[PDB]
Amino acid sequence: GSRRASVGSHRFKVYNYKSPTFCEHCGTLLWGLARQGLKCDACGMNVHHRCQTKVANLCEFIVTD
Ligand SMILES: [Zn+2]
Ligand SMILES: [Zn+2]
């Protein structure tokens, strides 16, 4: 089946956003045409590069057997 996992760290990777997107740590716009911020590979959370180390929430995602 599947489980709702909740883990201690995100897996952030630089991402190229295609529409105006806001930082899920600080709230403000991820500015630019490209490389505007980091998307978590596991849950999709978007943050600024400069906000990465400040992120304090759990990373939640569905795991399917
Ligand atoms: Zn995450
Ligand atoms: Zn931010």
UniProtKB/Swiss-Prot annotation:
UniProt subcellular location: Cytoplasm; Cell membrane
Span of zinc fingers (Phorbol-ester/DAG-type): 10-59
Tissue expression from the record: T-lymphocytes and skeletal muscle.
Q: Which family does it belong to?
A: Belongs to the protein kinase superfamily. AGC Ser/Thr protein kinase family. PKC subfamily.
- The record's note on its domains: The C1 domain, containing the phorbol ester/DAG-type region 1 (C1A) and 2 (C1B), is the diacylglycerol sensor and the C2 domain is a non-calcium binding domain.
Quaternary structure annotation from Swiss-Prot or TrEMBL = Part of a membrane raft complex composed at least of BCL10, CARD11, MALT1 and IKBKB. Interacts with GLRX3 (via N-terminus). Interacts with ECT2. Interacts with CCDC88A/GIV; the interaction leads to phosphorylation of CCDC88A and inhibition of its guanine nucleotide exchange factor activity. Interacts with CD28.
Q: What does this protein do?
A: Calcium-independent, phospholipid- and diacylglycerol (DAG)-dependent serine/threonine-protein kinase that mediates non-redundant functions in T-cell receptor (TCR) signaling, including T-cells activation, proliferation, differentiation and survival, by mediating activation of multiple transcription factors such as NF-kappa-B, JUN, NFATC1 and NFATC2. In TCR-CD3/CD28-co-stimulated T-cells, is required for the activation of NF-kappa-B and JUN, which in turn are essential for IL2 production, and participates in the calcium-dependent NFATC1 and NFATC2 transactivation.
* UniProt-recorded name of the protein: Protein kinase C theta type
What is the species listed in this Swiss-Prot or TrEMBL entry? Mus musculus
Q: What is the lineage of its organism?
A: Eukaryota, Metazoa, Chordata, Craniata, Vertebrata
Range of the intact protein held here: 232 to 281 of 707
